[PDB]
């Protein structure tokens, strides 16, 4: 059937680099000092129309975590991962956030939303 | 006893109102009873109230109820309990149309139940004529030329033209002349557009189209652009019967109304979850909504309140459409992702029927506007099933 | 001119009078109405069925209908009064020294267990006739206080947990008031929830640090799960599934035997606590900074949102109750007890009498007129019908 695609709105939008379906915007950004597999990676707050696979435990630069792989809802291409559990207490601020690889997303300019007249 | 005395007194009071007096006098003379404490004086018209309550309870449990004669308190037989005839309920498949060579995406009727339009992923639209004396569907003509498939079909008020759209990121739409079977205009403004929703003006000479990239146009028959709006990512559109009001649902979970003549906008609905599709009733008073990861909702367009929430349907990954239907619009029909069709009555939230027989997803469901015993369901396996009364 | 509707009622009245034990006025009525024998043989006892249907309709609309046959007067509509609904304080229990954090009735509604902020759990026995509560047992040794209490399915054992960052739990037997094994796995654990197994021989415990265990009566560890920070637990009736609410604002079902997990509820605000109806189909849950929400687990759909309770940060517990679980009771931070009927989102009562915040409310399962309320002022209130 026709896959339902959401929209988050705003300015400075991010999109999947393969099919150009929006994922998030600049507003929901936390830290850009992250490293993935293809280079630098970004940590966001909320990402729309993603997919999730299964819980896997692995060792990273800061302790041991359990994560899930994420992928585009329209083209089925891997974009990053999402945290579920973090063993190190200090590393709990990223418990439910999403990392996307900067080489797999594209930035675009989106117009400001028309502000309702509240009528 | 005492319950017998109450019945005797109430029967006497009721009989005294039908012009009988000797019978009442002899009944009060042989039983021994007699007619603001209830012993001092009896309430007025109590037996009639009890009988009306009994008839109302009989109507409440009527499963397939018809509400046309719900305003007539009298004129219902008391000798036998009331039950409607489900003989005309469409709960048995009787025809399987399999001529699309790919998965089917949309189905619609022709505003009078004479023709049925089907649109599928194999880049074609098929029209089926309905035989009036048999209720049998036969192919009439095929319309080809689409590229990415057909996802939304809109009928003209006089059923002389129709408009076919495409899926996401399709920047053109087709307008077909249905009498001669030829193409009139294929409209496209810019290569970066996206037109996924279309609706017709009640006068049948203009139509409003829109998409999720910020495009919201009102156009003529020849494809000429007439009006434009900026700053809205529309998903579903509908034109009100006054001729100068367009209801549009956006990505902020709103169903706001707009006026192109004087450039005005209002606030109507506000949902807690994303909205896929909606349809308004015949008199433009109620709205039926398909909500992501939730059920099917009903809203009042004047009081601006939620009326009921219907459960049992699964959705959220695919786009699914529903419809009003039945005699005087008493039933609600919808598809789902679990390979079956759900039917609800307006009086209850739980489903009445769960019709199975499809092997893959059910995307759209269409009721016949003028034949209340005809439904069509298009599935995600290449089939269109026609449902009618059981044998 | 008597129309068709009149004739049917006339024949019904004639049949009823003839069958009642009278034989004169029926003949006199026929001799004047002039109509008598489907129009051949009337159904037997039509008026009785019609009047019973009317009485059933009258009973359907009754609001404060907590009640558990031609005994109803036909001259006036039937209404259950509010003074019979439990809305008036009947007992004030003042035996705890510091505070009260949790109160719970037994599964057969014979005893009440209240856990205080100081080191005490108190058991009250309910008289069956006069419905009065009397202390019978006191249990001591909970160094950090008691915040959660769970009853065995046959009301022979109860498990009492502590507050946050407490690495122990206690297991008593009610019959003799003695102490079974005091379970403690790791010195740096935190156990704050517990749920029993319908066979009554195993339980499941968990905590915020990431502990999720299934253990036996002797205290041994049978199973453990890693990667979840549970907040509230409940074992289903089938004896395999455990429903747990996590810190990701969702409820998930877990299967220890096959080691599987699925999703059921996804919300947008923290879930402080939840409870599940008797048939295991509906979940009533408390949402932080919002009201009380009802969820259908089989269909996974939010049904109703009840408004009126203030709850910002603290944990507040609500409950089902009524004649057939048609009523919802809850506490709130504004010193009041709230009661709703399932058909509307507006409260049908707003009780009062507590000095400080109320944080536990319970309904008697076997006596649908007794409510227990526990608050931070050091007293417990037993609510019943008006005198
Ligand atoms: Zn993609
Ligand atoms: Zn009916
Ligand atoms: Zn009652």
Numbering used by the authors:
A (entry chain Y): 2 to 120
B (entry chain W): 121 to 155, 274 to 629
C (entry chain 7): 119 to 155, 276 to 306, 311 to 629
The paper states:
Here, we discover that human WDR26 binds the metabolic enzyme NMNAT1 and mediates its CTLH E3-dependent ubiquitylation independently of canonical GID/CTLH E3-family substrate receptors. Cryo-EM structures of NMNAT1- and YPEL5-bound WDR26-CTLH E3 assemblies reveal an internal basic degron motif of NMNAT1 essential for targeting by WDR26-CTLH E3, and degron mimicry by YPEL5’s N-terminus antagonizing substrate targeting. Within the supramolecular WDR26-CTLH E3 assembly, the WD40-repeat β-propeller domains from two WDR26 dimers are exposed and provide multiple binding surfaces for NMNAT1.
Cryo-EM maps revealed how YPEL5 inhibits substrate targeting: there is structural overlap between YPEL5 and NMNAT1 binding sites on WDR26-CTLH. Molecular details of YPEL5 binding to WDR26 were revealed by a 3.2-Å-resolution focused refined map. Our structural analysis revealed multivalent binding of a single YPEL5 to both WDR26 β-propeller domains in a WDR26 dimer. YPEL5’s N-terminus presents a sequence that mimics NMNAT1’s internal basic motif that together with YPEL5’s C-terminus captures one WDR26 protomer. Comparing the NMNAT1basic and YPEL5 N-terminal sequences reveals a consensus G/K-R-X-ϕ basic motif (ϕ represents amino acids with a bulky hydrophobic residue including W, Y, F) that might be selectively recognized by WDR26. Taken together, we propose that YPEL5 inhibits WDR26’s substrate receptor function by mimicking internal basic substrate degrons, thereby preventing substrate ubiquitin targeting.
